[PDB]
Amino acid sequence: HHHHHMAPHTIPLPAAMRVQTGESGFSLKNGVRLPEKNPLSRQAERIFRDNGINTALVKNNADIIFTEDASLGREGYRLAVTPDSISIASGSVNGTLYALQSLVQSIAADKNGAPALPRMDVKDQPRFSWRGLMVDSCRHMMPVRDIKKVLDLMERYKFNTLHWHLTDDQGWRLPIAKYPRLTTVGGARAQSPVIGNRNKGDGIPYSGHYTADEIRDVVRYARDRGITVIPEVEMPGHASAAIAAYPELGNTDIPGYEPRVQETWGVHSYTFSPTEKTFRFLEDVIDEICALFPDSPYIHIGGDEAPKNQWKQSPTAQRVMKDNGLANEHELQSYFIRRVEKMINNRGKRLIGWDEIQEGGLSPTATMMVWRSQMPHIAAQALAQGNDIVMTPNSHLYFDYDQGPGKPAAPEYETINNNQLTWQHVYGLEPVPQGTPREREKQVLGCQANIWTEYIPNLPKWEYHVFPRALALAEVAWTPQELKNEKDFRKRLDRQLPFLDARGVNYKRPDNGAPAQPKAVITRER
Structure with missing residues (x-):
């Protein structure tokens, strides 16, 4: 198109990620609907809200679809994002957690500056256990x-x-x-x-x-x-x-x-x-x-x-x-x-x-x-x-x-x-x-x-x-x-x-090495 979403900023970099930045993405401007019966929705609720995205637990027609694929093992996952749905495949709960963390680090601005996810596909698994x-x-x-x-x-x-x-x-x-x-x-x-x-x-x-x-x-x-x-x-x-x-x-x-x-x-x-x-x-x-x-x-x-x-x-x-x-x-x-x-x-x-x-x-x-x-x-x-x-x-x-x-x-x-x-x-x-x-x-x-x-x-x-x-x-x-x-x-x-x-994390700033929170109190008192 003429609007291109920014590419994901996910760390760690996924092993395989295909982002079509010019295509229509998934709009997050009105939040994400999660399937109310799936226990994974409570983790998705936590992670999306950590990143400023509203969620609702819904009876039907959720935005996120959770699927099971034993071949993804303990920690592997797949993501597929289209304008219609967010599909997350995993072999275990932790693969779904990692898919969700990759998702929130793929949030980008749409044409009007509202949060969106680009059209994208990810297949990911860790090098080390x-x-x-x-x-x-x-x-x-x-x-x-x-x-x-x-x-x-x-x-x-x-x-x-x-x-x-x-x-x-x-x-x-x-x-x-x-x-x-x-x-x-x-x-x-x-x-x-x-x-x-x-x-x-x-x-x-x-x-x-x-x-x-x-x-x-x-x-x-x-x-x-x-x-x-x-x-x-x-x-x-x-x-x-x-x-x-x-x-x-x-x-x-x-x-x-x-x-x-x-x-x-x-x-x-x-x-x-x-x-x-x-x-x-x-x-x-x-x-x-x-x-x-x-x-x-x-x-x-x-x-x-x-x-x-x-x-x-x-x-x-x-x-x-x-x-x-x-x-x-x-x-x-x-x-x-x-x-x-x-x-x-x-x-x-x-x-x-x-x-x-x-x-x-x-x-x-x-x-x-x-x-x-x-x-x-x-x-x-x-x-x-x-x-x-x-x-x-x-x-x-x-x-x-x-x-x-x-x-x-x-x-x-x-x-x-x-x-x-x-x-x-x-x-x-x-x-x-x-x-x-x-x-x-x-x-x-x-x-x-x-x-x-x-x-x-x-x-x-x-x-x-x-x-x-x-x-x-x-x-x-x-x-x-x-x-x-x-x-x-x-x-x-x-x-x-x-x-x-x-x-409010007091990280060491990459640009100048200073504390991100220079007035943070460093003390032994508890």
């Missing part, structure tokens, strides 16, 4: 209402996994009924590093945990948005809060044994003891995790950054090594993780751990979360041994890292280091390691960014660290590698900003 973000609730804790805002944005960009880092040295947030001190004692630290002066303590206690009903509410809310919540309980390291709560779980026979919920960032030395009592405790904890996260295919057990010195100094640990023919403390760690894997497997789930779990021997059935990009042989060795991996490289996907220029100099915006990890860097990530045999590519489950919160006290700063980098990651995680194009991505990114502004 694991498309994740990790929330660190230990260093700072975010309330449920803020996690829910995160999960809404994760669904918009087709993330399907929330890795919930729930226990560490500076706080334990996971409610365990049988061991209430884990949260009443382990959920509280006496102070935190001063903002802008990290080598000094602020003298202000910081405490909290999620109640069991809050855990279950987050899991359900996520599930309704296509997202599986995977819990992490850290062991054998990053354990100071649990050991402070129950000092018998640590290496009590070492010189100068003084556990506490830690008040400082970095690596700490308090590790779980490798005793029968500790394994009984861990089995009880794993049992309650399975009750809180009954649909999670995995339990993440950490496994990262566990210093061996306390085990070296502990006669108890040395005797366990001799009992079990273990030559060194790396083999002791492998033994520890093997015993916990049995607990997880006996409850029908799979173990995942940080790539340090290959120390002393990588279990043939574990899944490895690869983060140490300075050691590229670890992922290669894990793949060659047949193990599944999830790529969370600190070269590309550690979103505690700084970004490009433009941030405020104020101490509130300080970060762990001065590495600049830009959204452009993220967009250039290719998750499959070079040289991976074609037949082993299916072992690369996907990728995920980790948002460590030492320097991220609350949601406005979290948003600054995560958006727009998470949009680049969403495309890496979903879109075929050969369709990535940074120039086109930037055009689609710019057209996302009005939606993000309407929610």
Whole structure:
């Protein structure tokens, strides 16, 4: 025609999309009619209204037709938009969610400036099955209402996994009924590093945990948005809060044994003891995790950054090594993780751990979360041994890292280091390691960014660290590698900003690097 609709601004870019911008589209000026009997209409209602489009549940002659096609699998979908109807095909609920998110990101102005959808056809499915973000609730804790805002944005960009880092040295947030001190004692630290002066303590206690009903509410809310919540309980390291709560779980026979919920960032030395009592405790904890996260295919057990010195100094640990023919403390760690894997497997789930779990021997059935990009042989060795991996490289996907220029100099915006990890860097990530045999590519489950919160006290700063980098990651995680194009991505990114502004998201502006919400308050108060 003479009027051409704008092309969709969907991120991630769909694998196959045919838009006839000149043809007559579907008018949204009077809202969308949804079939009142289909449960998917309630999700369409939510997503359309999130984007300023009115909806009505109707008895007959709805505007949207939902169809079932098992060949689209867990997450694939088709879209067909004509002036007469919007047809959405999926093999599961989550494919319909993704179709709906693509639809609202295809809304364009008609001749008269009213919202419309162009004549278009989409067939789409993700490259990777694991498309994740990790929330660190230990260093700072975010309330449920803020996690829910995160999960809404994760669904918009087709993330399907929330890795919930729930226990560490500076706080334990996971409610365990049988061991209430884990949260009443382990959920509280006496102070935190001063903002802008990290080598000094602020003298202000910081405490909290999620109640069991809050855990279950987050899991359900996520599930309704296509997202599986995977819990992490850290062991054998990053354990100071649990050991402070129950000092018998640590290496009590070492010189100068003084556990506490830690008040400082970095690596700490308090590790779980490798005793029968500790394994009984861990089995009880794993049992309650399975009750809180009954649909999670995995339990993440950490496994990262566990210093061996306390085990070296502990006669108890040395005797366990001799009992079990273990030559060194790396083999002791492998033994520890093997015993916990049995607990997880006996409850029908799979173990995942940080790539340090290959120390002393990588279990043939574990899944490895690869983060140490300075050691590229670890992922290669894990793949060659047949193990599944999830790529969370600190070269590309550690979103505690700084970004490009433009941030405020104020101490509130300080970060762990001065590495600049830009959204452009993220967009250039290719998750499959070079040289991976074609037949082993299916072992690369996907990728995920980790948002460590030492320097991220609350949601406005979290948003600054995560958006727009998470949009680049969403495309890496979903879109075929050969369709990535940074120039086109930037055009689609710019057209996302009005939606993000309407929610007041404090993203890092692509144009000048400044916060989108420069007056947002960044504070530890809750």
